[PDB]
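question for whoever is on the cluster today: can someone run the full assembly for these? two chains, 125 residues total. i dont have access anymore since they changed the login thing
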Amino acid sequence: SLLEFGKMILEETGKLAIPSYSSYGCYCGWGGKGTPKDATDRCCFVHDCCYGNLPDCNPKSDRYKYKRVNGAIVCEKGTSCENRICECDKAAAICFRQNLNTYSKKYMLYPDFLCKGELKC
Amino acid sequence: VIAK
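^ ran it for u. tokens below:
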């Protein structure tokens, strides 16, 4: 659930999920269209696509459990939806951390009309 | 704590 993804973000990047990742580029927070504007935005695009392969689950509200062996994210066994939601989130966080060095403030609150074109998952 |  969003509860988890967001604390996972915070633990990983050091930034708060809502301001920093809730409205970035074209795909972070409201995804529907356009070309992702960067790494971080692409992370969100792969993330939205990951949720996409789970039409019968509920990403934002279904809670899963996870632990850290050392720095590593390890998803604990739950329902099949929960394990798979957890795997999509783990990816996004790592993806966010691997591209922190190019995170740009100019893509915060990015206007909708500047997101043009479909891109296939 | 995030998005959508």
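summary bc i know u wont read the tokens: Residues 80-97 of chain A form the longest helix (18 residues). Residues 1-121 of chain A form a domain with the Phospholipase A2 fold (CATH 1.20.90.10).
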